[PDB]
Design a protein around this ligand. Structure first.
Ligand SMILES: [K+]
Ligand SMILES: [Mg+2]
Ligand SMILES: [Mg+2]
Ligand SMILES: [Mg+2]
Ligand SMILES: [Mg+2]
Ligand SMILES: [Mg+2]
Ligand SMILES: [Mg+2]
Ligand SMILES: [Mg+2]
Ligand SMILES: [Mg+2]
Ligand SMILES: [Mg+2]
Ligand SMILES: [Mg+2]
Ligand SMILES: [Mg+2]
Ligand SMILES: [Mg+2]
Ligand SMILES: [Mg+2]
Ligand SMILES: [Mg+2]
Lengths: 233, 67, 49, 120, 252
RNA sequence: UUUACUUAUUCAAUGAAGCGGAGCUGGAAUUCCACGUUCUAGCAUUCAAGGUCCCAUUCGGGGCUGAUCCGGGUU
RNA sequence: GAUGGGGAAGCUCCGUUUCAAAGGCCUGAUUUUAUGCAGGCCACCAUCGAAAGGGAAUCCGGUUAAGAUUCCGGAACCUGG
């Protein structure tokens, strides 16, 4: 106590060279980091035509969790499951004269963009999930309108990576249910009701609404200041 | 599949959606190097039409040329 | 200078073979007087408010 | 994402550098010693001047490999002739070969060594 | 038929500046937080001669606000600045000769030097010996300062542009006759290869527009259009008038 | 034609360090102003001492504050 | 005069720290191995460019047909360890 003293440092201008501070706001980030951040910025600074910016509306957290829980009951065969099915099918058709129907009818989520588009055009899809982050977006921009025209319930959902986990891939960009088990028909109907309430019933209204046009932090503050002064006087 | 829709949509270059995508992507390409590896085709339908297959050994490179 | 002992290159004082004696003395006097004036300025600021 | 990073400079992060684990050898037979004693020491130099150096200066005069340095000359002479070397001086002759004046230590007699290795 | 001398100057082979002996580029401090908000005190360590420059330079040492070290700056010394003088640079610095202040922080009629054309260019205007800029007014809204330049031009600069209070030292330099080709020689030996100058009329037609003729004479008007091309711009380029200047300057 | 907007484009600087918006404190009327350095050619660096909380013990170690918060738009 | 970049149909040109994720050296700890995970210190940059510029340290005597501040004798000095 008597040997230690308070020696406060004067960190004001012209004194006591500044302490190490969090400069993460001022980091000269690599070019790829700057590019991805400013691409995200520019995509909302520009006015986004309504075909895009209908994808900023995604399934809410709870409805998405319910949808993904339902879709997780219809995962496709992994390599091990397919190998086991194939051996139990061969060792059955060889001996018991089965008509290659020694395995039951599979009930699996349908994936692959071309496959799901074909199912939508054939009205076989009972529910379509469209990833919101498909990097070339033209692969899925027509999907909400295609589903709306074919009367197929669709939800724009967060994560091609999540759909990839659904279908045992890294990314999937779509995930469809064409048939569902009887114990899950009611869950599918309720979830389709929620999903149509969020996307398909709103489609005619979101199709005429532009997105983007959002200013940055500083421009927003400047516009708020000038609207407070000029507009409210 | 989706490639027919991609092909028809790619022909509406002066539509609002394609104009927006053009502006954003031209900015991104300009920010990148003059020649740089592209992770995937920007137009998968066009790449398939021109002979690209999504297998190991096929490569896409983006290149900027003065007009 | 790498081949000679420390005694040849220094002087036994606060700045040795860097600053001359008179400059060192001026540094001593300036440091002491300016620190004292800093104390005086601080107390004058505190008693003028 | 939310780390402090008190410097405004971003540096390339340190990543693991795996040592090479080749699937096949690069040469498939290591080369034998390219400069052993037998080609470090080409042959003794037996001019009248060199023989005078052998007689009077305790210095053996050798033609040596143009790639051989003084360490190599010293160790090759030591191995080949079982003598201690006090000093090695070298030059490149005008004919493009290398001549080494190898002064043996006082323990050995260069005339005796030359007699043994066959030039008197 | 030949590339003329003023054309040859642009390639910069023998016409580059002789910069060996120079002390370094004379610049203000980098415009940082301390100067933008308060001030920083430096010390004038040396007032030195710069080769090829009439004005003396002042080496001014500041503390680094973010790292424990000293930063030496090369200012152009204003007249009256002395070694051991404390220089104050920033928005809050006092109106004393040698201090570096934003143009908007000084009153009308202030004499400044090494004035930035834009905030942070570290000094562009009134840098030659004896020259200065005068602050003639402020426009606080859309913050600008109107200033008078050594040439007499009026310029509108950002109020955050900085300048050094006072006049550049070494004034009156051109009042002494050089008196000697050798003195001109030594002057330009440390600047560039622009001396001596051969008159174009003393050349041949191949060498210069003015060359040739059985008498030395220009032959056509020496006033040359602004739109003329390289190899033609010898003489009086885009001259509004010629002849012995009789009348007033500062046209209204 | 004059003018605004900013993200294209353009210019410039920096080791992209303190930008923008709020707030605390004091003064004065929801607003305003202030909000660490100026006799002196010294010195100013060791996650800053101090304060506080935790652990773990004889070495000490860690967090918070000191040094307001928010937006990650380097300016 | 490479690199990063940009230009050029191209041979190549510009530019030399630039619009680049451009780093080895200290060591807490590690010693499943003084290293990877992991405490923490420093960078606005290849390289070439001088036998008259800068620069660690050697002198004397003797010796050959022809070498000598290099050999021999003696006597020193510097650098790295
Ligand atoms: K003529
Ligand atoms: Mg691949
Ligand atoms: Mg030699
Ligand atoms: Mg030059
Ligand atoms: Mg003249
Ligand atoms: Mg003349
Ligand atoms: Mg003539
Ligand atoms: Mg002519
Ligand atoms: Mg003419
Ligand atoms: Mg004539
Ligand atoms: Mg080159
Ligand atoms: Mg060299
Ligand atoms: Mg020399
Ligand atoms: Mg001779
Ligand atoms: Mg000797």
């Amino acid at each position: 106590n008597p040997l230690t003293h308070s020696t406060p440092k004067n960190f004001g201008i012209g004194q006591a060279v500044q302490p190490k501070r969090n400069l993460s706001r001022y980091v000269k980030w690599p070019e790829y980091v700057r590019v991805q951040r400013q691409k995200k910025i520019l995509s909302i600074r520009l006015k986004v035509p309504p075909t895009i910016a209908q994808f900023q509306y995604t399934l809410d957290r709870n409805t998405a969790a319910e949808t993904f829980k339902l879709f997780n009951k219809y995962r496709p065969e992994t390599a091990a499951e397919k190998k086991e099915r194939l051996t139990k099918e061969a060792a059955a058709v060889a001996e018991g004269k089965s008509k290659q129907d020694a395995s039951p009818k599979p009930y699996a989520v349908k994936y692959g963009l071309n496959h799901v588009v074909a199912l939508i055009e054939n009205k076989k899809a009972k529910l379509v999930l469209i990833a919101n982050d498909v990097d070339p977006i033209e692969l899925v921009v027509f999907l909400p309108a295609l589903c709306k025209k074919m009367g197929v319930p669709y939800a724009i959902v967060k994560g091609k990576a999540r759909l990839g986990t659904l279908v045992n891939q890294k990314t999937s960009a779509v995930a469809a249910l064409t048939e569902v088990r009887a114990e899950d028909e009611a869950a599918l109907a309720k979830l389709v009701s929620t999903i149509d309430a969020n996307f398909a019933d709103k489609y005619d209204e979101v199709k005429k609404h532009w997105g983007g046009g959002i200013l940055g932090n500083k421009a927003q503050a400047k516009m708020d200041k000038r609207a407070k002064n000029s507009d409210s006087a | 599949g989706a490639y027919k829709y991609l092909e028809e949509l790619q022909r509406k270059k002066q539509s609002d959606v394609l104009r927006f995508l053009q502006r954003v992507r031209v900015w991104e390409y300009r920010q990148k190097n003059v020649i740089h590896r592209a992770a995937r085709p920007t137009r998968p339908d066009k790449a398939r039409r021109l002979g690209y297959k999504a297998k190991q050994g096929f490569v896409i490179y983006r290149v900027r040329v003065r007009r | 200078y790498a081949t000679v002992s420390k005694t040849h290159k220094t002087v036994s004082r606060a700045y040795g073979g860097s600053r001359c004696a008179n400059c060192v003395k001026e540094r001593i006097i300036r440091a002491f007087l300016i620190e004292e004036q800093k104390i005086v300025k601080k107390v004058v600021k505190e008693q003028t408010e | 994402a939310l780390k402090v990073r008190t410097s405004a400079t971003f540096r390339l992060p340190k990543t693991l550098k795996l040592a090479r684990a080749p699937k096949y050898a690069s040469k498939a037979v290591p080369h034998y010693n390219r400069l052993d004693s037998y080609k470090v020491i080409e042959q003794p130099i037996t001019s009248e001047t060199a023989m005078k150096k052998v007689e009077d200066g305790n210095i053996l005069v050798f033609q040596v490999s143009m790639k051989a340095n003084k360490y190599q000359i010293k160790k090759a002479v030591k191995e080949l002739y079982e003598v201690d070397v006090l000093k090695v001086n070298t030059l490149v002759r005008p004919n493009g070969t290398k001549k080494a004046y190898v002064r043996l230590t006082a323990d050995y007699d260069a005339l005796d060594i030359a007699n043994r290795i066959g030039y008197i | 038929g030949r590339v003329i001398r003023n054309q040859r100057k642009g390639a910069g082979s023998i016409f580059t500046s002789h910069t060996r002996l120079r002390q370094g580029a004379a610049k203000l401090r980098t415009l940082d937080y301390a100067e933008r908000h308060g001030y920083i005190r430096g010390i004038v360590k040396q007032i030195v001669h710069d080769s090829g420059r009439g004005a003396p330079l002042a080496k001014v040492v500041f503390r680094d606000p973010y790292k424990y070290r000293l930063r030496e700056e090369i200012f152009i010394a204003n007249e009256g600045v002395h070694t051991g003088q404390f220089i104050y640079a920033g928005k809050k610095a006092s109106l004393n000769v040698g201090n570096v202040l934003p143009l908007g922080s000084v009153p009308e009629g202030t004499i400044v030097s090494n004035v930035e054309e834009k905030p942070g260019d570290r000094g562009a205007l009134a840098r030659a010996s004896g020259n200065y800029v005068i602050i003639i007014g402020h426009n606080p809204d859309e913050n600008k300062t109107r200033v008078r330049l050594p040439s007499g031009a009026k310029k509108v600069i950002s109020s955050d542009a900085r300048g050094v209070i006072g006049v550049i030292a070494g004034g009156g330099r051109v009042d002494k006759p050089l008196l000697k080709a050798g003195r001109a020689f030594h002057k330009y030996r440390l600047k560039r290869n622009s001396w001596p100058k051969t008159r174009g009329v003393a050349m041949n037609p191949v060498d210069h527009p003015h060359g040739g003729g059985n008498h030395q004479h220009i032959g056509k008007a020496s006033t040359i259009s602004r739109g003329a091309v390289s190899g033609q711009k010898a003489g009086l380029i885009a001259a509004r008038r010629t002849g012995l200047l009789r009348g007033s300057q500062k046209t209204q």
